[PDB]
Design an enzyme around this catalytic site. Structure first.
Site, PDB file in Angstrom:
ATOM      1  N   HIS A 152       0.812  -1.219   0.000  1.00 55.14           N
ATOM      2  CA  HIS A 152       0.000   0.000   0.000  1.00 55.14           C
ATOM      3  C   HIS A 152       0.849   1.276   0.000  1.00 55.14           C
ATOM      4  O   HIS A 152       0.661   2.151  -0.861  1.00 55.14           O
ATOM      5  CB  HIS A 152      -1.000  -0.100   1.161  1.00 55.14           C
ATOM      6  CG  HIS A 152      -2.016   1.004   1.229  1.00 55.14           C
ATOM      7  ND1 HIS A 152      -1.671   2.330   1.380  1.00 55.14           N
ATOM      8  CD2 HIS A 152      -3.343   0.995   0.954  1.00 55.14           C
ATOM      9  CE1 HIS A 152      -2.766   3.070   1.359  1.00 55.14           C
ATOM     10  NE2 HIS A 152      -3.791   2.288   1.071  1.00 55.14           N
ATOM     11  N   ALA A 159      -6.779  -8.125   2.562  1.00 58.24           N
ATOM     12  CA  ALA A 159      -8.043  -8.383   1.889  1.00 58.24           C
ATOM     13  C   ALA A 159      -8.117  -7.678   0.544  1.00 58.24           C
ATOM     14  O   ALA A 159      -7.386  -6.718   0.281  1.00 58.24           O
ATOM     15  CB  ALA A 159      -9.217  -7.928   2.760  1.00 58.24           C
ATOM     16  N   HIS A 160      -9.000  -8.164  -0.331  1.00 60.10           N
ATOM     17  CA  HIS A 160      -9.230  -7.390  -1.534  1.00 60.10           C
ATOM     18  C   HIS A 160      -9.874  -6.068  -1.110  1.00 60.10           C
ATOM     19  O   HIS A 160     -10.636  -6.013  -0.141  1.00 60.10           O
ATOM     20  CB  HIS A 160     -10.119  -8.160  -2.510  1.00 60.10           C
ATOM     21  CG  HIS A 160      -9.362  -9.135  -3.359  1.00 60.10           C
ATOM     22  ND1 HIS A 160      -8.447  -8.762  -4.320  1.00 60.10           N
ATOM     23  CD2 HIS A 160      -9.464 -10.484  -3.441  1.00 60.10           C
ATOM     24  CE1 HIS A 160      -7.961  -9.844  -4.903  1.00 60.10           C
ATOM     25  NE2 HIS A 160      -8.574 -10.901  -4.399  1.00 60.10           N
ATOM     26  N   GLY A 161      -9.646  -5.028  -1.899  1.00 64.23           N
ATOM     27  CA  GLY A 161     -10.331  -3.764  -1.739  1.00 64.23           C
ATOM     28  C   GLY A 161     -10.177  -2.980  -3.016  1.00 64.23           C
ATOM     29  O   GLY A 161      -9.699  -3.503  -4.023  1.00 64.23           O
ATOM     30  N   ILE A 162     -10.558  -1.699  -2.968  1.00 63.37           N
ATOM     31  CA  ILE A 162     -10.468  -0.902  -4.193  1.00 63.37           C
ATOM     32  C   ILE A 162      -9.034  -0.905  -4.706  1.00 63.37           C
ATOM     33  O   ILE A 162      -8.795  -0.745  -5.912  1.00 63.37           O
ATOM     34  CB  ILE A 162     -11.020   0.514  -4.033  1.00 63.37           C
ATOM     35  CG1 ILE A 162     -11.274   1.044  -5.436  1.00 63.37           C
ATOM     36  CG2 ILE A 162     -10.018   1.428  -3.363  1.00 63.37           C
ATOM     37  CD1 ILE A 162     -12.116   0.063  -6.248  1.00 63.37           C
TER      38      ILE A 162
END
Ligand SMILES: O=C(O)CCC1=C(CC(=O)O)c2cc3[nH]c(cc4nc(cc5[nH]c(cc1n2)c(CC(=O)O)c5CCC(=O)O)C(CCC(=O)O)=C4CC(=O)O)c(CC(=O)O)c3CCC(=O)O
Lengths: 120, 119
Positions: free
Chosen positions: B9, B71-74
């Site tokens: 990120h 986790a998956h996210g945008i």
């Protein structure tokens, strides 16, 4: 007596909550804690304060809060400590919140990463 | 021939990058990949495009991109697929293989339990 609260980021998408829910259910399947709850920092319920109060109401006096985050960031250093009232929501005096460390660069993360690299 | 790109990120704080750096180092110590590089989605360098280009110039045509996200996210569904040109960057006859996130792996439970006990 003692509770485990798994805390996660939350997302406008459903996957972050689903992760925490599945993690909580597995911890529960392990039979290690009298009380296990999840809280999401943003966008999604249960929130971190709701999880802590539900834990208290179930009879916990010592609350282990685990940040299910890979790395420290503002959320683990500022926003969540805030919600937990650790930095200047009510925690009774007979209750102590114990805020634990994130996941970090655990050897098991490397293992997972290598599995993912190979599509497993 | 094949490269591993660990993507994270990034943060205004240094800890997110430090995590990716340590992970890349440990993967390197396992002698599994000819090329291992890291890229950060935001706030920090190497960016994701810079990591992919480095990998390509070192001779990789197959780029395994692993999202080091819980986790998956945008970011794993939109922002990163777009940086990879899967939906700034121009690749070649080279294939990007975009892998899955960590998810609720049993080993995550193991780590969480360790953390719960201060270990
Ligand atoms: O992305 C959205 O549009 C909505 C949800 C969201 C926001 C809210 C919004 O932007 O309206 C939010 C905000 C941001 N979180 C940000 C940062 C972090 N998000 C982080 C994570 C996430 N932000 C994820 C999601 C979010 N991060 C989400 C969920 C989603 O994708 O919707 C995740 C979790 C990713 C995961 O499971 O690893 C992390 C990493 C935590 C870790 O290392 O495990 C960080 C690092 C830090 O705290 O400094 C930051 C960056 C910053 O200002 O530092 C911000 C602002 C920029 C951004 O949208 O990315």
């Amino acid at each position: 007596m003692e509770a485990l609260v798994l805390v996660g980021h939350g997302s406008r998408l459903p996957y972050s909550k689903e992760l925490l829910v599945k993690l909580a259910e597995k911890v529960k399947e392990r039979n290690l804690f009298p009380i296990v709850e999840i809280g999401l920092m943003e966008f999604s319920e249960p929130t971190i304060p709701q999880a802590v109060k539900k834990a208290i109401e179930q009879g916990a006096k010592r609350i282990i809060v685990v940040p299910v985050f890979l790395a420290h960031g503002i959320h683990t250093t500022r926003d969540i400590p805030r919600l937990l009232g650790l930095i200047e929501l009510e925690i009774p005096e007979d209750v102590e919140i114990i805020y634990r460390e994130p996941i970090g660069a655990d050897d098991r993360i490397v293992d997972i990463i290598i599995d993912r690299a190979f599509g497993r």
